[PDB]
Amino acid sequence: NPESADLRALAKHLYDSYIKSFPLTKAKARAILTGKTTDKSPFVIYDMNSLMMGEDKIKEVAIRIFQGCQFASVEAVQEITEYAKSIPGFVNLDLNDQVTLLKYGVHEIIYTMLASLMNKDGVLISEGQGFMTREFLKSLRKPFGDFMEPKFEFAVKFNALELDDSDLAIFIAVIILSGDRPGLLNVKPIEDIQDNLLQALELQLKLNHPESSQLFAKLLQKMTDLRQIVTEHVQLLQVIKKTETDMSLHPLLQEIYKDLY
Amino acid sequence: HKILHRLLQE
C-alpha cells in the first residue's frame, strides 16, 4: 500500500547510505569469517608474538591494544556521524540535539556493529585484514582483560537474530533517534522521526524474515541491553583513566565521555 | 563538543 511504500523507500535510502558510510559491512565480514570467499584470509593474533608479526600487515602490549581500539572507535564515530546526516530530518534538528543524540548513540552503534565483526572465537580488526582471538583479549592484564568480554557476550546473543545489513541500517537509525537521551531541548521532532524508523524497521523485519517470529520485539529488548553495556564500558574507562597515567585519551572520545552516565 | 560540532557542520 502507499504508507508501506514510504517505509520501504526509507529502508532502501538508509541501506544505501549505510553501504556508503561503512567500509566493512556484515556481508563481507561473514564471508571473511566463514572463509567462503576468494580473498586472502586474515592474520590471526592469538598472543604477544603473533601481535608483533601482525603489526606489519595491519608502550606495554595491553596499552598498545587499547590505543588500537581507541583509533578504531574514532574512525567508527566519523562513519556513524556521516550516517546520521543521511537519516532524513536528522540535520534539520537543533544542532545541540544532533550532538546529544550522537554523544549517547555512537557507543551503542559501535557495539551493535562490532557484533557483525565477531564470533565466539574472536573479532575481525583493521577492516578484516586481522582477526584477534577472544582468548588473547581475555588474557590481557587487568583491567584490559575484561574490556572486550562484555562485547563478545552481547555479540553471540545479538548474532543469533541473524539480521542482515538492510535490517541493521534501520536498527542503528532507530538507536540514533532516541527521545530519552539526557539534555535534549526538543524531543517531539526526534520522537516523530523514531516513529517513522520504527515502522520502517517493523515492515523490514516482516518482509526480510517472514519465517522469523516477533524478531522486531526481540530486537527492541536488545536496545535496553545495549544501554547497560554502554554504562559498564564508561565505568571501566572511568577506572582505566585514573589507574593508568601512561594512557592518553583521544580528544573526540573525551568530548563524548565528558558528562556521560 | 567542537570536534563533534565540526563533524556535524562539515
Residue numbers in the entry:
A (entry chain A): 205 to 262, 275 to 477
B (entry chain B): 687 to 696
Provide excerpts from the study:
Peroxisome proliferator-activated receptor γ (PPARγ) belongs to the thyroid hormone receptor-like nuclear receptor subfamily 1, which is one of the ligand-activated transcription factors. PPARγ forms a heterodimer with retinoid X receptors (RXRs), recruits coactivators, and then binds to the cognate peroxisome proliferative response elements on target genes. Compared with other nuclear receptors, PPARγ contains a considerably larger Y-shaped ligand-binding pocket (LBP) with a volume of 1300–1440 Å3 and is known to be activated by numerous endogenous and synthetic ligands.
However, from previously reported PPARγ LBD structures, we found that Arg288 was very flexible depending on ligands. To reduce the effect of Arg288 on ligand binding, we generated the PPARγ R288A mutant LBD construct and could resolve the imatinib-bound PPARγ R288A mutant LBD structure. To further gain structural insight into imatinib, we also determined the crystal structure of the ligand-free PPARγ R288A mutant LBD in the presence of the SRC-1 peptide. In the ligand-free states of PPARγ WT LBD and PPARγ R288A mutant LBD, the Oδ atoms of Asp380 formed a hydrogen bonding network with the Oγ atom of Ser382 and the Nδ atom of Asn424 with a distance of 2.6 Å and 3.0 Å, respectively. We found that the distance between the Cδ atom of Ile341 and the Cδ atom of Leu255 changed from 6.9 Å in the ligand-free states to 6.3 Å in the imatinib-bound structure.
